[PDB]
Design a protein around this ligand. Structure first.
Ligand SMILES: CO[C@H]1[C@@H](O)[C@H](O)[C@H](OC[C@@]23C[C@@H]4[C@H](C)CC[C@H]4[C@@]4(C=O)C[C@@H]2C[C@H](C(C)C)[C@@]34C(=O)O)O[C@@H]1C
Ligand SMILES: Nc1nc2c(ncn2[C@@H]2O[C@H](COP(=O)(O)OP(=O)(O)O)[C@@H](O)[C@H]2O)c(=O)[nH]1
Ligand SMILES: [Mg+2]
Lengths: 841, 89, 52, 94
RNA sequence: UUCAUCUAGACAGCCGGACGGUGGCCAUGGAAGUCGGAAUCCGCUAAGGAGUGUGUAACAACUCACCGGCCGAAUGAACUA
């Protein structure tokens, strides 16, 4: 149907007349092709034009490659009779209905668009298969919308390839789709909330459908239950009840009996495959073998229209023509959507709460709850929707409770803005209110509570995702979720150094075009990128090479960096001198336990705090001597790290003047490291003896630099050469039907498991694990391949534990890494010892 | 008496069962799929919504069938080491 | 798609074997002597590596 | 009680939990033994024991699953020692 | 070539169970008979090894074991040529 803005906002004015939902799935289960047939049937369009076929007008260069990354809620025009709306438990009225349905690409490792489409709708369209049923990945997306609270609607798609490329049998096909139900009775029973109670979907009430995309056919139980309820003398709700379970009509005793046994023991075939699938089975061999022995004559036994160009074709293309006519696309689909998948107004009765979080019974919260479309504007862009206009970025959001207009100066706040600040709170005037339509957007003017649409010119200051509030007391909603957490790492730095400014601009532009992505800098000095999946990352990277940045970018395996530590106490007091042989600094290096060394970098012990009150903290409870803490000079590296300088001397009458000379040289030394070239950790210097010669012409600056240098250089080598390797923290949530598959990954990829736990009785477990920084480069693939995509790794950087090998040892782990680290600089290929760094007469 | 049971050795009496709740949390029902029985969920607890005539009384029993029947506490080898010959004073 | 106990009798043919450690030949589950002579009769048999 | 390889049976009546433990061989070797055989031992391995105790593990065998179906103290005259590398009591076990 | 088990009752082999203490000493994120090492026992009978492997994340469960019906009565261990 060809509408205009008034006809749009007409059905938009009607709150109970809008279907706010997306599409939960298990990968390529006819979702993109399902939506293409809906525009060709009656999908609302603009003030002109006429485009109908398949793909093309839903995906673009994604058409030549092959994928769906644009998940928008294209609203359509429904034609639901007044008799259907006769039992709908909503305050909806009319004939002309709206359908705010989002595309949403099902599969895992991309649950980014998935968790963002759930954060803007009351329900969703689940697409399971006949050749797969309710498997691992649907388990993922289904249990996902249940720990989010949404209304479930099933469509066992591809029953077309289950009777053409294969072909099933009558009553055996009963338990096929009845088993897809017993698999749905598993996801619902555990992950469904007590707030919705009895919600296990049963096509015994018209909740589960039957369809195929290239066939243009959409079937719902309620379809022939109503086109036959009257032709039997049975109740409409009791006719579909005697069509699932104890449903055997007898064309002999002519009664809908419970038990299929008779006064002999002979059975009774299903009246569902006797009045609904019996003649339906006749339609199979009807065009499959071209049996004109029924075909047109059987067409009247079913009530179908035979029009010219219909019998003008042949074969399977002919069966698609009567499939889209026996069970029309938009007709049956929009049917169950306008049936048991509500409008924001009647479904937010449970959704409203978990949406806006932080304040118990908040003021704007009760407004979003009862829903007030002219109250304090409550909006949340779950993920901006940028297009292809040289960088024309838009914002994808749910207008909970409130109106938005063209030129409204609203408070565009961010997840960092909390009532008592102004940070990310860029109260800017919106240039224009946008109205997205499937894959494109056009100019509109306003929208109310319970709608889904966008905003423009907000991109200039809003980063990642943003909440739109016009009320100041407004806190924010829940900061999304993501039980997926990015676990991909790459050294994505410049391939052409002349355009480095373009990389950092686009790194944010990646965050700009992504639900969850880490576009930070390397602690080594390169530009690190972190994605959800390998497939995922890869894509956004070529997009970083064409527009986002636009020029040659070289990706390399994640360049690493660890800490330089000591094992036992320094062997002997290391004596040092100047290139003069004048000033002589003698010292040692001692061990700092985790709780006190980690406490240095934490802030418990910080240089930007007086050494008197800081010495009290250490002395009194921790157990760090008072005079030793009132003697700590510098915190290497720079001025706050876990590599101290505690002076334990008594002589040298000129120590007080060049105190910062020892301190500043040490900040330069722990920064550009000895064993390879990076920074140390948990090593505190204990300077015991020193010598101050002639004037300051020999006491300071560069004369003192090669002194404090070889000082700790020789001391690190004496305090025992070892290294603390960087430990990662990943909590993988995966079903008990795959617990030992991840355990295989552990007994192999260093099983430093913090501990294995979860919730005795539930599916997925909470697998706490300690894993090296490099022991995680590809960890994503092995986890899911070990035990299906049932594994869900929660990434973040943890602590540093004991590394077995030794830095100065060329063939052992540590040494091999260090020797490979010096060739990473492009110079020296050896480990110089403290023998060539100790001082004697 | 006492004597519980064994699996996959004999198929003696006809396998019959009633339709009420077992009360077990949702788990071993992924095999109740691939097998084919009328099941559902009673507010979480695993409830059989029909009296099923599983297998026959005179065939080869196995691995899949013993899993669901051992969860019901059924014991077909209802017998107990008893007597044979008799002798007294 | 193959039934648990029905897929069990399918293993009694292409799973329950014993691979020769120099011939590879497909032989019996309790067999301990080769049937070909490209090795002149041997006993080096490891019950064929089945699935995990 | 016992914190290493100790069997624990949790019998609940829909929110009314009742505590009953099988008192494993592990539970009893710590049951009558003094402090160096009860707490402070995790970094230091427990393989210490020889001193005689007598008929007191006769009552302690009444707590270690009485599913052995014979004579209590006569069966532990083997159990505590060859499986219990902590305590040797009366040298007649092994 | 040396060494066993038995005809008023053996073998390969057909069929039935497979005990507990015990989820054993520790070690445990996790090893309850089956990653690991040391202990490698008797209560009781026809018998059941702190256990032959598979398979478990660990359990569970199958199953080698030991033990009873069937076995024709012999051929098994081991090497020599
Ligand atoms: C919130 O998202 C987080 C988590 O995914 C995690 O904390 C991750 O850790 C990255 C690293 C952090 C380390 C410390 C902070 C000191 C050393 C740093 C690293 C380099 O060696 C180790 C891990 C992996 C990265 C190497 C590959 C360069 C690090 C880096 O940021 O450079 O960082 C992103 C931004
Ligand atoms: N014949 C037939 N082909 C299908 C069906 N579903 C998907 N396909 C094929 O899959 C291709 C792309 O499907 P896609 O849009 O990726 O499915 P989606 O990932 O669930 O959206 C189409 O070009 C079809 O050829 C179906 O039900 N019937
Ligand atoms: Mg697609």
């Amino acid at each position: 149907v060809a509408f205009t803005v008034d006809q749009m906002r007409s059905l938009m004015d009607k709150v109970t007349n809008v279907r706010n939902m997306s599409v939960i799935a298990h990968v390529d289960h006819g979702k993109s092709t399902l939506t293409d047939s809906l525009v060709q049937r009656a999908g609302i369009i603009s003030a002109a034009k006429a485009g109908e076929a398949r793909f093309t007008d839903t995906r673009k260069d994604e058409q030549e490659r092959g994928i769906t990354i644009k998940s928008t809620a294209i609203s359509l025009y429904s034609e639901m009779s007044d008799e259907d709306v006769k039992e709908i438990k909503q305050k909806t009225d009319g004939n002309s209905f709206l359908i705010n349905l989002i595309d949403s690409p099902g599969h895992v490792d991309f649950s980014s668009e998935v968790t963002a489409a759930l954060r803007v709708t009351d329900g969703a369209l689940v697409v399971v298969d006949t050749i797969e049923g309710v498997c691992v990945q649907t388990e993922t997306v289904l249990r996902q919308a249940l720990g989010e609270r949404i209304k479930p609607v099933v469509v066992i798609n591809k029953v077309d390839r289950a009777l053409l490329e294969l072909q099933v049998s009558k009553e055996d096909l009963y338990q096929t789709f009845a088993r897809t139900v017993e698999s749905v009775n598993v996801i619902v029973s555990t992950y469904a909330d007590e707030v919705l109670g009895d919600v296990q979907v049963y096509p015994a009430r018209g909740t589960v459908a039957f369809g195929s995309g290239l066939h243009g056919w959409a079937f719902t139980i309620r379809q022939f239950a109503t086109r036959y309820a009257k032709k039997f003398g049975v109740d409409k709700a009791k006719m579909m009840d005697r069509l699932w379970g104890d449903s055997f009509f007898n064309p002999k005793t002519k009664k809908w009996t419970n038990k299929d046994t008779d006064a002999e023991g002979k059975p009774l075939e299903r009246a569902f495959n006797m009045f609904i699938l019996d003649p339906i089975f006749r339609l199979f061999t009807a065009i499959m073998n071209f049996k004109k022995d029924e075909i047109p004559v059987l067409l009247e036994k079913l009530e179908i229209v035979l029009k010219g160009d219909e019998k003008d074709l042949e074969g399977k293309a002919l069966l698609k023509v009567v499939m889209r006519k026996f069970l029309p696309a938009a007709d049956a689909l929009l049917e169950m959507i306008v049936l048991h998948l509500p409008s924001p107004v009647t479904a937010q009765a449970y959704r409203a709460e978990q949406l806006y979080e932080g304040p118990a019974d908040d003021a704007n919260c009760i407004a979003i709850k009862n829903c007030d479309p002219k109250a304090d504007l409550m909006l949340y862009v779950s993920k901006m929707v940028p297009t292809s206009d040289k960088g024309r970025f838009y914002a994808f959001g749910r207008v909970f409770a409130g109106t938005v207009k063209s030129g409204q100066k609203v408070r565009i706040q961010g997840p960092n803005y909390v009532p008592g600040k102004k940070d990310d709170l860029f109260i800017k005037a919106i240039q224009r209110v946008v109205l997205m339509m499937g894959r494109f957007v056009e100019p509109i003017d306003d929208c109310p509570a319970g709608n889904i649409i966008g905003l423009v010119g907000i991109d200039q200051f809003l980063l990642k995702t943003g909440t739109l509030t016009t009320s100041e007391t407004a806190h924010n909603m829940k900061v999304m979720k993501f039980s997926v957490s990015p676990v991909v790492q790459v050294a994505v730095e410049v391939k052409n150094a002349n355009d480095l400014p373009k990389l950092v601009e686009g790194l944010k532009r990646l965050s700009k075009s992504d639900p969850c992505v880490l576009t930070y800098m390397s602690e080594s000095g390169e530009h690190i990128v972190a994605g959800t999946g390998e497939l995922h990352l890869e894509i956004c990277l070529q997009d970083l090479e064409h527009d986002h940045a636009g020029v040659p970018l070289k990706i390399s395996p994640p360049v690493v960096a660890y800490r330089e530590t000591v094992e036992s106490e320094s062997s002997q007091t290391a004596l040092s001198k100047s290139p003069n042989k004048h000033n002589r600094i003698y010292l040692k290096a001692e061990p700092i336990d985790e709780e006190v060394s980690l406490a240095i970098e934490n802030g418990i012990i910080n240089p930007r705090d007086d050494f008197k009150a800081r010495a009290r903290i250490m002395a009194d409870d921790y157990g760090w001597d008072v005079t030793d803490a009132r003697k700590i000079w510098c915190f290497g590296p720079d001025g706050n790290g876990p590599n101290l300088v505690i002076d334990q001397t008594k002589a040298v009458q000129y120590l007080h003047e060049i105190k910062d000379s020892v301190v500043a040289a040490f900040q330069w030394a722990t920064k550009e490291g000895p064993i390879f070239g990076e920074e140390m950790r948990s090593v505190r210097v204990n300077i015991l003896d020193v010598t101050l010669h002639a004037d300051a012409i020999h006491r300071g600056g560069g004369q003192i630099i090669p002194t404090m240098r070889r000082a700790t250089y020789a001391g690190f080598l004496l305090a025992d050469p070892k290294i603390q390797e960087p430990v990662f923290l990943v909590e993988i949530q995966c079903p008990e039907q795959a617990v030992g598959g991840i355990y295989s990954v552990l007994n192999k990829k260093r099983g430093q498991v913090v501990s294995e736990e979860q919730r005795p009785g539930t599916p997925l477990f909470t697998v706490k694990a300690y894993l090296p920084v490099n022991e995680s480069f590809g960890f994503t693939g092995e986890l899911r391949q070990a035990t299906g995509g049932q594994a869900f790794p929660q990434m973040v950087f943890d602590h540093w534990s004991t590394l077995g090998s030794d830095p100065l040892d060329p063939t052992s782990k540590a040494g091999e890494i260090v020797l490979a680290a010096r060739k990473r600089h492009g110079m020296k290929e050896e480990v110089p010892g403290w023998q060539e760094y100790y001082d004697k007469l | 008496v006492a004597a519980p049971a064994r699996a996959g050795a004999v198929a003696p009496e006809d396998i019959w069962v009633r339709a009420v709740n077992t009360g077990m949390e949702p788990g071993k029902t992924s095999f109740f799929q691939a097998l084919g029985v009328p099941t559902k969920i009673a507010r979480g607890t695993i409830e059989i919504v029909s009296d099923v005539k599983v297998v026959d009384a005179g065939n080869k029993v196995g691995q899949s069938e013993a899993s669901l029947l051992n969860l019901l506490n059924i014991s077909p080898f209802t017998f107990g080491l008893t007597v044979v010959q008799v002798y007294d004073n | 798609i193959i039934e648990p106990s029905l897929k069990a009798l399918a293993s009694k043919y292409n799973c329950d074997k014993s691979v020769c450690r120099k011939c590879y030949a497909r032989l019996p589950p309790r067999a301990t002597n080769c049937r070909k002579r490209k090795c002149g009769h041997t006993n080096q048999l490891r019950p064929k590596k089945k699935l995990k | 009680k016992g914190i290493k390889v100790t069997v624990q049976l949790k019998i609940q009546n829909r929110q009314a939990a009742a505590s009953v433990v099988p008192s494993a061989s592990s539970l009893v070797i710590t049951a009558l033994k003094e402090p160096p055989r009860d707490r402070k031992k995790d970094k230091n391995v427990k393989h210490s024991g020889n001193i005689q105790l007598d008929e007191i593990i006769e009552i302690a065998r009444q707590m270690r699953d009485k599913s052995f179906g014979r004579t209590l103290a006569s069966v532990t005259k083997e159990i505590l020692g060859t499986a219990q590398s902590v305590g040797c009591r009366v040298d007649f076990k092994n």
